[PDB]
UniProtKB/Swiss-Prot annotation:
Protein name, as recorded: Myoglobin
Subunit text: Monomeric.
GO biological process terms on file: removal of superoxide radicals
SUPFAM superfamilies in the cross-refs: Globin-like
Residues bearing the modification Phosphoserine: 4
GO molecular function: heme binding; metal ion binding; nitrite reductase activity; oxygen binding; oxygen carrier activity; peroxidase activity
Classification via PANTHER family: MYOGLOBIN (PTHR47132:SF1)
Family that this chain belongs to: Belongs to the globin family.
Source species taxonomy: Eukaryota, Metazoa, Chordata, Craniata, Vertebrata
Top-level taxon: Eukaryota
Amino acid sequence: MVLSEGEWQLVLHVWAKVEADVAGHGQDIFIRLFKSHPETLEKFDRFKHLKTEAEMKASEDLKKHGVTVLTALGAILKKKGHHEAELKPLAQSHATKHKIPIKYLEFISEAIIHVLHSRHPGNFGADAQGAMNKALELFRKDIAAKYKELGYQG
Ligand code: HEM
């Protein structure tokens, strides 16, 4: 699949807003993910002890992790589809070291859309959400293909 320049513009326009507060968006997204799909929390040995949203918000390590994740995702989105090089190491660590099923990538994609919808309604209307979903589907599709080449079905 391929996004048009118009769709990329919608994606990058709302992403520019997210970059005004990467740490904050990172926390909201992971808290949403962990609360909505608690099973994903078990994949993080560093955070699986967190019991409440309050503890999650107060975790300095979780906040730093969120920044690392969103920074990596932002770099991929800014490539506008030409992300082969960026995807290689990400696909290897998540398939081989962390063992993250494609299903879980769908869950975090849902969390990202939910947070952008809540925080940026004016810049995240129907068309913008469709563009973001398409960009994330492309990401998940290419990651899945790499998973297979690497020997991980998940
Ligand atoms: C938007 C998709 C995602 C991106 C861009 C992303 C990115 C990253 C990055 C850059 C790191 C640090 C470097 C590395 O280990 O490769 C990381 C670590 C990790 N990711 Fe992801 N990730 C994504 C989704 C997920 C999901 C859905 C899970 C599982 C629910 C997951 C689990 C992990 C784990 C367990 C680590 C190691 C954390 C640690 O122990 O420090 N990731 N991820």
